[PDB]
Amino acid sequence: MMEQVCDVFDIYAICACCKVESKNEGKKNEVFNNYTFRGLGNKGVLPWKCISLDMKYFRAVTTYVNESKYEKLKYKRCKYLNKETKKLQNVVVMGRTNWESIPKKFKPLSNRINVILSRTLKKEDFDEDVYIINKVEDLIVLLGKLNYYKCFILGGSVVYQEFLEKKLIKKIYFTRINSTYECDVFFPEINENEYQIISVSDVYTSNNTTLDFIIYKKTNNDDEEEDDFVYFNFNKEKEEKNKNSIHPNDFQIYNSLKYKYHPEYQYLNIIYDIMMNGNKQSDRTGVGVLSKFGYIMKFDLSQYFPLLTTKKLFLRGIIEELLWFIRGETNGNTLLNKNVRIWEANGTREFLDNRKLFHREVNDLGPIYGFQWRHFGAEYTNMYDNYENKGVDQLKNIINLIKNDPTSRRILLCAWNVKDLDQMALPPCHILCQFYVFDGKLSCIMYQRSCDLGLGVPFNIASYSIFTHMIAQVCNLQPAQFIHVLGNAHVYNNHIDSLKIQLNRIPYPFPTLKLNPDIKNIEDFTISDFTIQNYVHHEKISMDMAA
Amino acid sequence: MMEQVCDVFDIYAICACCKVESKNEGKKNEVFNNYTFRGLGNKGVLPWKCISLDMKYFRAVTTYVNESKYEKLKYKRCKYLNKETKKLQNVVVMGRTNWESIPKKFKPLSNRINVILSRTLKKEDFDEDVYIINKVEDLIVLLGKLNYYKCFILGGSVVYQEFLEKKLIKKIYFTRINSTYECDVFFPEINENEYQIISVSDVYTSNNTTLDFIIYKKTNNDDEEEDDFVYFNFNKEKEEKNKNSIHPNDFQIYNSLKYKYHPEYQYLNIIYDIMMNGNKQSDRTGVGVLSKFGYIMKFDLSQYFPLLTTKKLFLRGIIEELLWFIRGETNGNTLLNKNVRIWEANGTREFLDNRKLFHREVNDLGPIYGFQWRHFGAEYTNMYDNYENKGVDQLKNIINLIKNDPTSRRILLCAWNVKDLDQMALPPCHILCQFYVFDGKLSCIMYQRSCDLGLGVPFNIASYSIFTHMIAQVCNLQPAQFIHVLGNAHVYNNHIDSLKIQLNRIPYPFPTLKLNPDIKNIEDFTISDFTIQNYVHHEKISMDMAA
Numbered sequence A, B: 001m002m003e004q005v006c007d008v009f010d011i012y013a014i015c016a017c018c019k020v021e022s023k024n025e026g027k028k029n030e031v032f033n034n035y036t037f038r039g040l041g042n043k044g045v046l047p048w049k050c051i052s053l054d055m056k057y058f059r060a061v062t063t064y065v066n067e068s069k070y071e072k073l074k075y076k077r078c079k080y081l082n083k084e085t086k087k088l089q090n091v092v093v094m095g096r097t098n099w100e101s102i103p104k105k106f107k108p109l110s111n112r113i114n115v116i117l118s119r120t121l122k123k124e125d126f127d128e129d130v131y132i133i134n135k136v137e138d139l140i141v142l143l144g145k146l147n148y149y150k151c152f153i154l155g156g157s158v159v160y161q162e163f164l165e166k167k168l169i170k171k172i173y174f175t176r177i178n179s180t181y182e183c184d185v186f187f188p189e190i191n192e193n194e195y196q197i198i199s200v201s202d203v204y205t206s207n208n209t210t211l212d213f214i215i216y217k218k219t220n221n222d223d224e225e226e227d228d229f230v231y232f233n234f235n236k237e238k239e240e241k242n243k244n245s246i247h248p249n250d251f252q253i254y255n256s257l258k259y260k261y262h263p264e265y266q267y268l269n270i271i272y273d274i275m276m277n278g279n280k281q282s283d284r285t286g287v288g289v290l291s292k293f294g295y296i297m298k299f300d301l302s303q304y305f306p307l308l309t310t311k312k313l314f315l316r317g318i319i320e321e322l323l324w325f326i327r328g329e330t331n332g333n334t335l336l337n338k339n340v341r342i343w344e345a346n347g348t349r350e351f352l353d354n355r356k357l358f359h360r361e362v363n364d365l366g367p368i369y370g371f372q373w374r375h376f377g378a379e380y381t382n383m384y385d386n387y388e389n390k391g392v393d394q395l396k397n398i399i400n401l402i403k404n405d406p407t408s409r410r411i412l413l414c415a416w417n418v419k420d421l422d423q424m425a426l427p428p429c430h431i432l433c434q435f436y437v438f439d440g441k442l443s444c445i446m447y448q449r450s451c452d453l454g455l456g457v458p459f460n461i462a463s464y465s466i467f468t469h470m471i472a473q474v475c476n477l478q479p480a481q482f483i484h485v486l487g488n489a490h491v492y493n494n495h496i497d498s499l500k501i502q503l504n505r506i507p508y509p510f511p512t513l514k515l516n517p518d519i520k521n522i523e524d525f526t527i528s529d530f531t532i533q534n535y536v537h538h539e540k541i542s543m544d545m546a547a
């Protein structure tokens, strides 16, 4: 161990990678991994038309200096080589093709030191205060003579390839662009043993793509108020109750992360919380849970579609269910004949009998969500009866409100009808949603009384997110936030090992949802009006791992 | 200027102060201020029995050392003095009387260098490893000689007084014990110009009293990861929604605080978030609001009763309301005969006509909370009707589920009867409340669709905290958490001046709720079964200044 080269000289790789078109060997049969995001360039330019937010990220990472921490680094640098050499700048390193593709109005890059890798050009051509090298070591030298903050390797592929071959990068600042384009040059396969992810940012939309910012790190083979903090923590616990449940190392990869800003962590951190701090309880099913009470999650629907990526999820079933609710239906068979088996178990002879609904036809689920959304307060008879004009059509009511009185605080869709609870195959989990409108934008809160975190909550997030889009569109509004409130939040005992596996997986930038813009009424949507674009995801998990 | 002594040598005071018996007057109109907490001792001993949480705090602060921080402290002290440069310990200083009040088995205070101020006793009178000094100057000299972390002045009042009078105290660690005792010695009057509060802790219960810990400050007359933080922060805007009608100094006291752990800040932080980032909107009245969507507050009912202290609130009205709900009443005249006017505006002829309830008698509020709690589904006729065994008695049901199925996820009381909204004098604000039972403890979530932060939310927190206590007591449980979910959370425009004021007030430790333990059925409570103890509060505010 010689104190490392790129740790002394602060040498970093900053890149942007899209998905690569290897059409047409399937689409539904795809095994995703980190290597998915790979495409650097195509025929002398970037694969994409623009991408402004990654441009603005690049700008701030490569032009940010901290004057204070510099002395700590200047003292560190001169000590190693034995040497001595207005405002402070960063050193950006690039190749020739890379350098000559940028416009002359934007050359050289403002407030940086612009080194170039080329076995061709000499200094005479650039009369400017810009440097040239010609070998792998010539940079190491040129940094020693210069006063800088950090060193950023800008590519392209060959430049990147050989900076990682000779192990001269400590950290990789990596934008994942969640879309496909034609590419002929690729970022290299990042080796597993060498580099590991340490931070993952929030998810964003810039110019019709989602994207996220991750960071890889290299791996081995005044002060009174800081005391005031320790004082306020005098009574804090020295160990948690679930230590007959959890080993130190179950969450190695989850805990190895420094910044977890991906909105999926809002879901994973709740599961972590329950597994660590939750309460051992029985329940109706007999399986037993770890439970806690009261959480809030928020998803920014303007930036992404919150479909979980740490496991595989399918949407057709939940969209069929949503459209069946909107119709006012309670007929389990309509769903069964489309091969959506969400309500199957809830409609059997055995099940209906355990509910003492002895006189109810198989798959007649009684006055559940659909019925309450369209006919609240009407007498339920059977699934085939004519209910047209009977009871309060909440759905129509909330839509008229959202259009005609947006500032109303009464825009609520409720399924918890106390009168009818006992006639329902089972009482509703999603008690209600409340809508909110400001500046042409719709947000939705959904209160959920009971939440199976391993199995149900992933579908529930997606479903009310879709529903929020549907409502917004048919009201001439843009979707804003979906806010999910959790009552009894539980992890079922038979889900533990599966969640230990899931929680150690690193989220992918989220997909998006496209709706047919022609649909102007809630009643008019059909299954093919829905498209999930750019769904990148880990492999499926069977939530109890044997059946 | 040659720096302050207290700063070189790190001299802090630490005390615990209770409230003092000033009897034979009648505590119906009491003024509270910082000087409310001033009682130090009685008859040469502590005014209270134990208060072990304060003792644990006192020990933790006075014995806490940071080795890594000393090397700098050493440098500074030796710089100030022209000098060169077992385990590290703090110095503790006490008066003679204070030293003699300490039990033998605890003398000298463990892991601390002990120092005594005394003229009557000399070194030869002490068996113990202690320093005797006869003048304050001599501590300064001694501190220059010793290796130590920090220096804490422990009392009594005479020591405290002269340290403050000679201006040698740089922070005061102050425990406010929220109960009244007989005292003969008092901590000195702290001057607002010389010291101000900079931190405020959580509220707790120890030995049948609430307490908290505040910090006064002296006023005048891998470091790698921190760049990654700035990089993830690239996309953070310059300004806020309204950043000129909100002046810098509107919240100067509020923003002057480093640690705001007092649970009353869950409420004041919400107002603040709405005042700075809220949305400008109209509402059903002409007044207008700043609004946001979706918050959660959590109050630990085992540690305190969260009655807002930053202004004056009374509970007689809201307890009657609650008792009126529980009885299933919809008759406005009942609350007016007890001089409670909460529902008066909503029961008037003009108000009822404007709701199109022309055939409704004045103060017949229709099928509101009470009716829904005891008769969900029944046909409302008039407020005088007999509704026995009509509808679903939700209240008996949830009491039954708490007692016999505590692990149920269906323990929910719903006021939002969609069928009835139009017949109610006005739709409900408190939509639902869901209960949770674990280890003999009851928690409660209330979902509020519409939240008047200036005027409604403070009482609502109280109502539902009281309600949680009542339900827990009749079910043989102990209250745990009240969890409050806010939907449309709004600050009215006419409340802005008075909330700018309220938010610069610093909270006092919360009071406690006492229910008569003999009450065993939810229907048996009466006004006199409720006592609020030790309510310490700032002056009453009028939320609008047009009435």
Ligand SMILES: NC(=O)c1ccc[n+]([C@@H]2O[C@H](COP(=O)([O-])OP(=O)(O)OC[C@H]3O[C@@H](n4cnc5c(N)ncnc54)[C@H](OP(=O)(O)O)[C@@H]3O)[C@@H](O)[C@H]2O)c1
Pocket (backbone or CB within 6 Å): A015, A016, A017, A040, A041, A042, A043, A044, A045, A046, A094, A095, A096, A097, A098, A099, A101, A117, A118, A119, A120, A121, A133, A134, A135, A136, A154, A155, A156, A157, A158, A159, A160, A162, A185
């Ligand atoms: N996201 C990104 O990373 C990014 C950014 C901009 C553009 N691109 C795209 O990707 C391409 C750039 O990547 P690339 O790898 O193909 O080209 P490049 O890295 O920009 O430049 C390669 C050229 O630089 C010279 N060179 C390479 N390694 C060297 C070394 N160790 N010492 C001295 N000279 C060296 C070589 O010959 P010469 O001496 O003859 O030049 C070589 O032809 C562009 O065509 C563009 O479309 C990608």
Ligand SMILES: NC(=O)c1ccc[n+]([C@@H]2O[C@H](COP(=O)([O-])OP(=O)(O)OC[C@H]3O[C@@H](n4cnc5c(N)ncnc54)[C@H](OP(=O)(O)O)[C@@H]3O)[C@@H](O)[C@H]2O)c1
Pocket (backbone or CB within 6 Å): B014, B015, B016, B017, B039, B040, B041, B042, B043, B044, B045, B046, B094, B095, B096, B097, B098, B099, B101, B117, B118, B119, B120, B121, B133, B134, B135, B136, B154, B155, B156, B157, B158, B159, B160, B162, B185
């Ligand atoms: N609740 C709390 O946080 C707290 C904290 C501290 C104390 N207390 C209570 O308050 C009681 C004591 O308070 P107190 O004010 O009566 O007595 P004190 O301040 O503990 O001690 C005063 C005595 O110390 C000596 N002394 C003080 N200043 C001196 C100076 N500059 N130079 C030389 N000698 C000095 C004198 O001793 P000689 O008479 O020997 O000359 C004097 O009689 C204790 O019994 C304790 O229970 C409570």
Ligand SMILES: CCc1nc(N)nc(N)c1OCCCOc1ccc(-c2c(N)nc(N)nc2CC)cc1
Pocket (backbone or CB within 6 Å): A014, A015, A016, A054, A055, A058, A098, A101, A102, A103, A106, A153, A154, A155, A173, A174, A175
């Ligand atoms: C910005 C994308 C980018 N993003 C990340 N996370 N890492 C990188 N290394 C990277 O860049 C590749 C190396 C740099 O390549 C270029 C060429 C041209 C330009 C240009 C451009 N195409 N058009 C304009 N107007 N200005 C500029 C200079 C402002 C920007 C970056």
Ligand SMILES: CCc1nc(N)nc(N)c1OCCCOc1ccc(-c2c(N)nc(N)nc2CC)cc1
Pocket (backbone or CB within 6 Å): B014, B015, B016, B054, B055, B058, B098, B101, B102, B103, B106, B153, B154, B155, B173, B174, B175
């Ligand atoms: C603890 C109250 C207290 N609380 C705060 N925030 N600051 C103080 N200065 C303070 O006072 C300590 C100095 C007061 O002097 C005494 C006498 C007796 C005792 C004693 C006692 N009465 N009983 C036990 N068991 N132990 C101890 C010593 C551990 C402690 C301190």
Ligand SMILES: O=c1ccn([C@H]2C[C@H](O)[C@@H](COP(=O)(O)O)O2)c(=O)[nH]1
Pocket (backbone or CB within 6 Å): A284, A426, A427, A429, A430, A450, A451, A452, A453, A455, A456, A457, A460, B409, B410
């Ligand atoms: O959309 C749903 C429907 C059901 N559940 C789960 C929660 C409970 O684990 C179970 C229903 O049981 P009760 O809460 O009704 O006991 O199904 C969900 O998480 N989401």
Ligand SMILES: O=c1ccn([C@H]2C[C@H](O)[C@@H](COP(=O)(O)O)O2)c(=O)[nH]1
Pocket (backbone or CB within 6 Å): A409, A410, B284, B426, B427, B429, B430, B450, B451, B452, B453, B455, B456, B457, B460
């Ligand atoms: O217990 C209550 C009762 C009413 N409100 C407030 C919220 C609204 O400002 C107003 C009722 O108006 P709508 O939301 O129904 O418009 O009263 C409360 O905050 N708490």
